PDB file of all heavy atoms in Angstrom:
ATOM      1  N   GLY X 120     -31.433  58.550  25.436  1.00 37.15           N
ATOM      2  CA  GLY X 120     -30.502  59.347  26.189  1.00 37.15           C
ATOM      3  C   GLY X 120     -30.357  58.755  27.623  1.00 37.15           C
ATOM      4  O   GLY X 120     -31.308  58.106  28.107  1.00 37.15           O
ATOM      5  N   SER X 121     -29.286  59.030  28.288  1.00 34.04           N
ATOM      6  CA  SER X 121     -29.136  58.634  29.691  1.00 34.04           C
ATOM      7  C   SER X 121     -28.263  59.652  30.387  1.00 34.04           C
ATOM      8  O   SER X 121     -27.551  60.346  29.647  1.00 34.04           O
ATOM      9  CB  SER X 121     -28.362  57.309  29.786  1.00 34.04           C
ATOM     10  OG  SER X 121     -28.962  56.309  28.908  1.00 34.04           O
ATOM     11  N   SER X 122     -28.414  59.821  31.630  1.00 34.86           N
ATOM     12  CA  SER X 122     -27.579  60.760  32.363  1.00 34.86           C
ATOM     13  C   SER X 122     -26.239  60.186  32.768  1.00 34.86           C
ATOM     14  O   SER X 122     -25.346  60.895  33.235  1.00 34.86           O
ATOM     15  CB  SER X 122     -28.336  61.212  33.624  1.00 34.86           C
ATOM     16  OG  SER X 122     -28.451  60.039  34.412  1.00 34.86           O
ATOM     17  N   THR X 123     -26.044  58.845  32.519  1.00 33.77           N
ATOM     18  CA  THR X 123     -24.970  58.079  33.155  1.00 33.77           C
ATOM     19  C   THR X 123     -23.831  57.773  32.167  1.00 33.77           C
ATOM     20  O   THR X 123     -22.955  56.958  32.509  1.00 33.77           O
ATOM     21  CB  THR X 123     -25.546  56.764  33.654  1.00 33.77           C
ATOM     22  OG1 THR X 123     -26.079  55.954  32.576  1.00 33.77           O
ATOM     23  CG2 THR X 123     -26.757  56.986  34.654  1.00 33.77           C
ATOM     24  N   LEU X 124     -23.794  58.337  30.991  1.00 33.38           N
ATOM     25  CA  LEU X 124     -22.876  58.095  29.955  1.00 33.38           C
ATOM     26  C   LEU X 124     -21.447  58.588  30.260  1.00 33.38           C
ATOM     27  O   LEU X 124     -21.291  59.626  30.957  1.00 33.38           O
ATOM     28  CB  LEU X 124     -23.232  58.738  28.585  1.00 33.38           C
ATOM     29  CG  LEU X 124     -24.549  58.457  27.904  1.00 33.38           C
ATOM     30  CD1 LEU X 124     -24.668  59.150  26.534  1.00 33.38           C
ATOM     31  CD2 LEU X 124     -24.850  56.930  27.753  1.00 33.38           C
ATOM     32  N   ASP X 125     -20.418  57.823  29.908  1.00 33.96           N
ATOM     33  CA  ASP X 125     -19.000  58.230  30.169  1.00 33.96           C
ATOM     34  C   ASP X 125     -18.796  59.708  29.744  1.00 33.96           C
ATOM     35  O   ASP X 125     -18.200  60.427  30.477  1.00 33.96           O
ATOM     36  CB  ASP X 125     -17.974  57.299  29.558  1.00 33.96           C
ATOM     37  CG  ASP X 125     -18.096  55.847  29.955  1.00 33.96           C
ATOM     38  OD1 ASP X 125     -18.750  55.497  31.065  1.00 33.96           O
ATOM     39  OD2 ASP X 125     -17.657  54.919  29.320  1.00 33.96           O
ATOM     40  N   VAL X 126     -19.358  60.125  28.583  1.00 32.68           N
ATOM     41  CA  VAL X 126     -19.271  61.496  28.088  1.00 32.68           C
ATOM     42  C   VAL X 126     -19.916  62.575  28.990  1.00 32.68           C
ATOM     43  O   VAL X 126     -19.645  63.773  28.783  1.00 32.68           O
ATOM     44  CB  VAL X 126     -19.663  61.750  26.607  1.00 32.68           C
ATOM     45  CG1 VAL X 126     -18.472  61.540  25.720  1.00 32.68           C
ATOM     46  CG2 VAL X 126     -20.946  60.990  26.203  1.00 32.68           C
ATOM     47  N   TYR X 127     -20.861  62.220  29.846  1.00 29.53           N
ATOM     48  CA  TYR X 127     -21.541  63.192  30.698  1.00 29.53           C
ATOM     49  C   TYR X 127     -21.086  63.193  32.108  1.00 29.53           C
ATOM     50  O   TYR X 127     -21.644  63.783  33.013  1.00 29.53           O
ATOM     51  CB  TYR X 127     -23.092  62.987  30.703  1.00 29.53           C
ATOM     52  CG  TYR X 127     -23.723  62.964  29.362  1.00 29.53           C
ATOM     53  CD1 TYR X 127     -24.993  62.323  29.203  1.00 29.53           C
ATOM     54  CD2 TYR X 127     -23.197  63.630  28.245  1.00 29.53           C
ATOM     55  CE1 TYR X 127     -25.604  62.308  28.034  1.00 29.53           C
ATOM     56  CE2 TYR X 127     -23.801  63.599  27.021  1.00 29.53           C
ATOM     57  CZ  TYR X 127     -25.083  62.961  26.885  1.00 29.53           C
ATOM     58  OH  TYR X 127     -25.665  62.898  25.675  1.00 29.53           O
ATOM     59  N   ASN X 128     -19.999  62.403  32.353  1.00 26.95           N
ATOM     60  CA  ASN X 128     -19.375  62.362  33.667  1.00 26.95           C
ATOM     61  C   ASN X 128     -19.012  63.701  34.177  1.00 26.95           C
ATOM     62  O   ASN X 128     -18.043  64.402  33.628  1.00 26.95           O
ATOM     63  CB  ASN X 128     -18.234  61.431  33.545  1.00 26.95           C
ATOM     64  CG  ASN X 128     -17.643  61.050  34.830  1.00 26.95           C
ATOM     65  OD1 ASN X 128     -17.844  61.744  35.903  1.00 26.95           O
ATOM     66  ND2 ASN X 128     -16.876  59.932  34.831  1.00 26.95           N
ATOM     67  N   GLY X 129     -19.742  64.239  35.175  1.00 28.29           N
ATOM     68  CA  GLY X 129     -19.502  65.543  35.647  1.00 28.29           C
ATOM     69  C   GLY X 129     -18.336  65.934  36.497  1.00 28.29           C
ATOM     70  O   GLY X 129     -18.180  67.070  36.831  1.00 28.29           O
ATOM     71  N   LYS X 130     -17.474  64.964  36.785  1.00 29.34           N
ATOM     72  CA  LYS X 130     -16.354  65.213  37.793  1.00 29.34           C
ATOM     73  C   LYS X 130     -15.408  66.286  37.325  1.00 29.34           C
ATOM     74  O   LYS X 130     -15.014  67.208  38.086  1.00 29.34           O
ATOM     75  CB  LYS X 130     -15.695  63.942  38.236  1.00 29.34           C
ATOM     76  CG  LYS X 130     -15.250  63.018  37.083  1.00 29.34           C
ATOM     77  CD  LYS X 130     -14.935  61.670  37.657  1.00 29.34           C
ATOM     78  CE  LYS X 130     -13.421  61.364  37.549  1.00 29.34           C
ATOM     79  NZ  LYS X 130     -13.071  60.005  37.313  1.00 29.34           N
ATOM     80  N   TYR X 131     -14.993  66.199  36.008  1.00 29.89           N
ATOM     81  CA  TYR X 131     -13.984  67.122  35.469  1.00 29.89           C
ATOM     82  C   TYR X 131     -14.496  68.576  35.506  1.00 29.89           C
ATOM     83  O   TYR X 131     -13.718  69.444  36.029  1.00 29.89           O
ATOM     84  CB  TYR X 131     -13.655  66.681  34.033  1.00 29.89           C
ATOM     85  CG  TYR X 131     -13.376  65.226  33.998  1.00 29.89           C
ATOM     86  CD1 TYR X 131     -14.259  64.366  33.461  1.00 29.89           C
ATOM     87  CD2 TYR X 131     -12.157  64.689  34.446  1.00 29.89           C
ATOM     88  CE1 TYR X 131     -14.071  62.994  33.422  1.00 29.89           C
ATOM     89  CE2 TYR X 131     -11.893  63.302  34.416  1.00 29.89           C
ATOM     90  CZ  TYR X 131     -12.865  62.442  33.896  1.00 29.89           C
ATOM     91  OH  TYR X 131     -12.714  61.090  33.802  1.00 29.89           O
ATOM     92  N   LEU X 132     -15.655  68.805  34.981  1.00 31.48           N
ATOM     93  CA  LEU X 132     -16.160  70.177  34.942  1.00 31.48           C
ATOM     94  C   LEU X 132     -16.393  70.609  36.374  1.00 31.48           C
ATOM     95  O   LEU X 132     -16.040  71.797  36.703  1.00 31.48           O
ATOM     96  CB  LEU X 132     -17.382  70.228  34.162  1.00 31.48           C
ATOM     97  CG  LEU X 132     -18.192  71.543  33.952  1.00 31.48           C
ATOM     98  CD1 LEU X 132     -17.337  72.747  33.689  1.00 31.48           C
ATOM     99  CD2 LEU X 132     -19.147  71.334  32.814  1.00 31.48           C
ATOM    100  N   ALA X 133     -16.962  69.777  37.278  1.00 28.17           N
ATOM    101  CA  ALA X 133     -17.199  70.190  38.616  1.00 28.17           C
ATOM    102  C   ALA X 133     -15.894  70.586  39.282  1.00 28.17           C
ATOM    103  O   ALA X 133     -15.790  71.705  39.859  1.00 28.17           O
ATOM    104  CB  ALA X 133     -17.947  69.108  39.387  1.00 28.17           C
ATOM    105  N   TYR X 134     -14.904  69.713  39.195  1.00 28.69           N
ATOM    106  CA  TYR X 134     -13.561  69.940  39.749  1.00 28.69           C
ATOM    107  C   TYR X 134     -12.841  71.121  39.158  1.00 28.69           C
ATOM    108  O   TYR X 134     -12.541  72.156  39.784  1.00 28.69           O
ATOM    109  CB  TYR X 134     -12.675  68.709  39.717  1.00 28.69           C
ATOM    110  CG  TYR X 134     -11.192  68.907  40.130  1.00 28.69           C
ATOM    111  CD1 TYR X 134     -10.886  69.346  41.381  1.00 28.69           C
ATOM    112  CD2 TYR X 134     -10.174  68.819  39.159  1.00 28.69           C
ATOM    113  CE1 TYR X 134      -9.567  69.580  41.788  1.00 28.69           C
ATOM    114  CE2 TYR X 134      -8.832  69.000  39.529  1.00 28.69           C
ATOM    115  CZ  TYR X 134      -8.559  69.428  40.835  1.00 28.69           C
ATOM    116  OH  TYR X 134      -7.240  69.662  41.226  1.00 28.69           O
ATOM    117  N   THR X 135     -12.584  71.044  37.838  1.00 27.03           N
ATOM    118  CA  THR X 135     -11.880  72.093  37.142  1.00 27.03           C
ATOM    119  C   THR X 135     -12.463  73.445  37.343  1.00 27.03           C
ATOM    120  O   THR X 135     -11.665  74.307  37.815  1.00 27.03           O
ATOM    121  CB  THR X 135     -11.801  71.724  35.670  1.00 27.03           C
ATOM    122  OG1 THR X 135     -11.165  70.477  35.504  1.00 27.03           O
ATOM    123  CG2 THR X 135     -10.822  72.748  34.946  1.00 27.03           C
ATOM    124  N   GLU X 136     -13.761  73.620  37.133  1.00 27.24           N
ATOM    125  CA  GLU X 136     -14.352  74.976  37.243  1.00 27.24           C
ATOM    126  C   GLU X 136     -14.979  75.381  38.570  1.00 27.24           C
ATOM    127  O   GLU X 136     -15.527  76.469  38.681  1.00 27.24           O
ATOM    128  CB  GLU X 136     -15.315  75.226  36.075  1.00 27.24           C
ATOM    129  CG  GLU X 136     -14.601  75.332  34.672  1.00 27.24           C
ATOM    130  CD  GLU X 136     -13.624  76.437  34.594  1.00 27.24           C
ATOM    131  OE1 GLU X 136     -13.971  77.580  35.092  1.00 27.24           O
ATOM    132  OE2 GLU X 136     -12.573  76.194  33.995  1.00 27.24           O
ATOM    133  N   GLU X 137     -14.946  74.516  39.567  1.00 29.46           N
ATOM    134  CA  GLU X 137     -15.435  74.805  40.849  1.00 29.46           C
ATOM    135  C   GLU X 137     -16.923  75.125  40.808  1.00 29.46           C
ATOM    136  O   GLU X 137     -17.329  76.184  41.320  1.00 29.46           O
ATOM    137  CB  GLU X 137     -14.654  75.977  41.531  1.00 29.46           C
ATOM    138  CG  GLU X 137     -13.465  75.495  42.475  1.00 29.46           C
ATOM    139  CD  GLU X 137     -12.287  76.502  42.467  1.00 29.46           C
ATOM    140  OE1 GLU X 137     -12.366  77.682  42.004  1.00 29.46           O
ATOM    141  OE2 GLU X 137     -11.214  76.058  42.966  1.00 29.46           O
ATOM    142  N   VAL X 138     -17.723  74.255  40.211  1.00 28.03           N
ATOM    143  CA  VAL X 138     -19.146  74.383  40.162  1.00 28.03           C
ATOM    144  C   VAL X 138     -19.790  73.153  40.759  1.00 28.03           C
ATOM    145  O   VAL X 138     -19.139  72.064  40.852  1.00 28.03           O
ATOM    146  CB  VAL X 138     -19.727  74.521  38.665  1.00 28.03           C
ATOM    147  CG1 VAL X 138     -19.300  75.802  38.042  1.00 28.03           C
ATOM    148  CG2 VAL X 138     -19.403  73.325  37.838  1.00 28.03           C
ATOM    149  N   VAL X 139     -21.063  73.253  41.092  1.00 23.88           N
ATOM    150  CA  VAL X 139     -21.908  72.047  41.410  1.00 23.88           C
ATOM    151  C   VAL X 139     -22.538  71.655  40.129  1.00 23.88           C
ATOM    152  O   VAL X 139     -23.191  72.433  39.496  1.00 23.88           O
ATOM    153  CB  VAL X 139     -22.956  72.443  42.522  1.00 23.88           C
ATOM    154  CG1 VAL X 139     -23.786  71.167  42.898  1.00 23.88           C
ATOM    155  CG2 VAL X 139     -22.288  73.067  43.711  1.00 23.88           C
ATOM    156  N   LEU X 140     -22.268  70.425  39.712  1.00 24.53           N
ATOM    157  CA  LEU X 140     -22.881  69.944  38.492  1.00 24.53           C
ATOM    158  C   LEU X 140     -23.980  68.895  38.716  1.00 24.53           C
ATOM    159  O   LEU X 140     -23.795  67.865  39.371  1.00 24.53           O
ATOM    160  CB  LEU X 140     -21.797  69.340  37.543  1.00 24.53           C
ATOM    161  CG  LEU X 140     -22.347  69.087  36.139  1.00 24.53           C
ATOM    162  CD1 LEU X 140     -21.866  70.076  35.182  1.00 24.53           C
ATOM    163  CD2 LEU X 140     -22.022  67.665  35.709  1.00 24.53           C
ATOM    164  N   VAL X 141     -25.140  69.147  38.180  1.00 25.11           N
ATOM    165  CA  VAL X 141     -26.299  68.189  38.294  1.00 25.11           C
ATOM    166  C   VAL X 141     -26.656  67.683  36.853  1.00 25.11           C
ATOM    167  O   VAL X 141     -26.801  68.504  35.918  1.00 25.11           O
ATOM    168  CB  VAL X 141     -27.554  68.914  38.802  1.00 25.11           C
ATOM    169  CG1 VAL X 141     -28.740  67.959  38.771  1.00 25.11           C
ATOM    170  CG2 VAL X 141     -27.313  69.530  40.182  1.00 25.11           C
ATOM    171  N   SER X 142     -26.745  66.381  36.712  1.00 24.85           N
ATOM    172  CA  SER X 142     -27.421  65.798  35.566  1.00 24.85           C
ATOM    173  C   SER X 142     -28.715  65.197  35.956  1.00 24.85           C
ATOM    174  O   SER X 142     -28.691  64.341  36.852  1.00 24.85           O
ATOM    175  CB  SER X 142     -26.480  64.811  34.929  1.00 24.85           C
ATOM    176  OG  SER X 142     -25.988  63.868  35.833  1.00 24.85           O
ATOM    177  N   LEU X 143     -29.762  65.576  35.289  1.00 21.78           N
ATOM    178  CA  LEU X 143     -31.125  65.064  35.561  1.00 21.78           C
ATOM    179  C   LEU X 143     -31.485  63.942  34.574  1.00 21.78           C
ATOM    180  O   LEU X 143     -30.651  63.507  33.713  1.00 21.78           O
ATOM    181  CB  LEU X 143     -32.167  66.181  35.508  1.00 21.78           C
ATOM    182  CG  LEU X 143     -32.299  67.106  34.277  1.00 21.78           C
ATOM    183  CD1 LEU X 143     -32.884  66.383  33.094  1.00 21.78           C
ATOM    184  CD2 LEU X 143     -33.086  68.356  34.569  1.00 21.78           C
TER     185      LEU X 143
END
Side-chain angles (χ1 to χ4, degrees):
Chain X
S121 309
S122 63
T123 63
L124 299 187
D125 306 337
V126 272
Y127 304 158
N128 191 338
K130 46 193 251 214
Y131 313 101
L132 178 43
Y134 172 64
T135 303
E136 290 299 320
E137 265 147 16
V138 293
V139 182
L140 193 107
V141 175
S142 48
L143 52 72

